[PDB]
């Protein structure tokens, strides 16, 4: 995954 995609994964799992 890219830098943005690693940051997107974090945001999409934040409750």
């Amino acid at each position: 995954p890219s830098r943005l995609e690693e940051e997107l994964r974090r945001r999409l799992t934040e409750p």
Partner: nanobody
Amino acid sequence: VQLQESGGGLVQPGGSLRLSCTASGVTISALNAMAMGWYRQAPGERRVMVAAVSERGNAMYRESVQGRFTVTRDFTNKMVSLQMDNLKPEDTAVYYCHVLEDRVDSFHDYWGQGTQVTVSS
């Protein structure tokens, strides 16, 4: 980056709704290097990200909406859309168009206006 949502409003449980969003004040080449996506917020919750298309064209989803929500990005026309199928009462929220910029040391959030989606029998 200026973002504007179209669509919203009332749907019955199990129903479908499409939101769209256009970006302006940004070139195609600049916006290509950014992510585009969608957040939602119900009263008494924080804004949380539900779907995005990365700068590499990869759609990504929150588990609670995967399969039901489809996010699509038109790079050429600087648009992102959220097709919401099989909607549930707990999908009721204000939905925000969002762009994520990598500013190297930090990330920058660009926000749309928000549009209410209401799921009611």
